[PDB]
Amino acid sequence: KVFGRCELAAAMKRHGLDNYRGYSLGNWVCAAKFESNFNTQATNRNTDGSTDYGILQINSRWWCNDGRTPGSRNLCNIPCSALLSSDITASVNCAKKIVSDGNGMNAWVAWRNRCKGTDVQAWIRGCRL
């Protein structure tokens, strides 16, 4: 599924991401835009052989099992394919574990390089929330 901007903002808010660990909703929408272009089916392969999955591009070396990343962990205890669903629940629940692990949203390279320190509230302007 390819979400619209405000549709994704509303879904993320319902799943408890607004101000989660202090990150306002616009941060999460900005991250999803530049990680996946709001596409739940996005996948991208990394040089180390791991793969990033879904709307928030969660990596198989640490967070999910895809059966082809040897020596990796599965800290969210899910198959990586569950992160590609049109239902974002699994992605949100795993993202909550990632953002809580000490490094905040710096875990997402596109957030660090394209959202951090910008007016992220612009990403939810005009939306009925």
Q: List residues binding Cl ion (CB under 5 A).
A: 24-26, 104, 121
Q: Does 36 bind Na ion (CB under 5 A)?
A: no
Q: Does 40 bind Na ion (CB under 5 A)?
A: no
The residue among 48 and 119 lying less far from Na ion, judged by its C-beta, is: 48
Using Cβ positions, the residue closest to Na ion within the complex turns out to be 72
Catalytic annotation, pick one of 18, 35, 66, 87: 35
**Interface with Na ion in residues 69-108 (CB under 5 A):** 69, 72, 74
Do residues 86 and 40 lie in contact, with contact meaning Cβ atoms separated by under 8 Å? yes
Contacts of 82 (CB under 8 A, 6+ apart): 64, 90
What CA–CA distance (Å, rounded) separates 19 from 121? 12
From the list 35, 42, 1, 17, the residue with the least C-alpha distance to 108 is 35
Residue 7 to residues 12, 83, 85, 94: CA-CA distances in angstroms? 9, 18, 15, 20
Q: Does 60 bind Na ion (CB under 5 A)?
A: yes
Residues in the chain: 129
52 is catalytic: yes
Residue 101 marked in a binding site: yes
Which residues of the shown chain bind Na ion in the complex (CB under 5 A)? 60, 65, 69, 72, 74
Residue numbers belonging to the annotated binding site: 101
Residue numbers belonging to the annotated binding site for substrate: 101
